[PDB]
Design a protein around this ligand. Sequence first.
Ligand SMILES: CCC[C@H](C(=O)O)c1c(C)nc2ccc(Cl)cc2c1-c1ccccc1
Ligand SMILES: CCC[C@H](C(=O)O)c1c(C)nc2ccc(Cl)cc2c1-c1ccccc1
Ligand SMILES: [Ca+2]
Ligand SMILES: [Ca+2]
Lengths: 144, 144
Amino acid sequence: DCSPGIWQLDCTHLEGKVILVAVHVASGYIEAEVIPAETGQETAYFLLKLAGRWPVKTVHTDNGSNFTSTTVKAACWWAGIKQEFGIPYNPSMNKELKKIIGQVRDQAEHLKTAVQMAVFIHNKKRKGYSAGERIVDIIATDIQ
Amino acid sequence: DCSPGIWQLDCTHLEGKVILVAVHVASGYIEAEVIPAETGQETAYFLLKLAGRWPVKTVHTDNGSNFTSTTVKAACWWAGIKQEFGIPYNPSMNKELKKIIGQVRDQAEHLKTAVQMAVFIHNKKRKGYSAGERIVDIIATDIQ
Ligand SMILES: CCC[C@H](C(=O)O)c1c(C)nc2ccc(Cl)cc2c1-c1ccccc1
Ligand SMILES: CCC[C@H](C(=O)O)c1c(C)nc2ccc(Cl)cc2c1-c1ccccc1
Ligand SMILES: [Ca+2]
Ligand SMILES: [Ca+2]
């Protein structure tokens, strides 16, 4: 898609651990972190964090059941987030992110650290703005 | 101060818990979270997260010993962060943030949740842009 308030939220798996990945669809900018379990409370808390940092209007996911828990619904309610309906499911940051994590994996002991390193690398890599520059440009324009 | 890459990082205490608070000095925009202990590894991990999300050039603090641990130094090294020298120590988001947390405290069970709610409220409150609008404007301008 490409509206500036649209984000996509999914979980991946690596080293037996769960990584929550959010993508700002218009820019390719990512936020990701290892979470202790793939549960509604983790997703809800992550969304509240995300929404305080960026103007999150709608969220999409590739696993719709992710958004059925009462706790997640309460988080979208409180932050005024709606579900996104304009992106069809047609069955990949996850693998690109995983590629980077593999590249920097030995630079740190804990997977959670490597994930943040990969997020950093991803957001700053120019390809010609970087995703990090694109998101702030997109958002600022949309404000003014 | 007011250069766009300057952040300030401090910890506060509430309900026997530790809250790490980072302020983008130019805008007043905040990121904050409860951390399990006031240690170097927590600070280092937080800085890496922060640096992947915003262009962090220099960091200041009101407790200089916060930045003496080897792990913190390694995080600033990896992310290319330097210590800020242009802000003198003259002995307050912490209390403003605490005010908001008090106001929304019953809206959630866990302090960590209320903290994210307070961060959200703080960043979006207009007073006339909001801190959230100011930071992206400041950064985007500085890019172009
Ligand atoms: C971020 C904190 C955890 C991190 C890790 O690897 O997951 C870590 C740990 C556990 N311990 C350390 C001890 C010494 C040094 Cl220099 C660095 C580190 C680093 C480090 C590795 C890369 C960059 C910064 C710190
Ligand atoms: C964010 C997850 C933890 C949060 C809390 O309070 O710290 C929480 C928990 C533990 N349990 C819940 C059960 C039901 C509902 Cl509707 C909401 C929640 C909420 C909630 C409260 C406010 C906003 C969203 C969820
Ligand atoms: Ca329930
Ligand atoms: Ca040491």
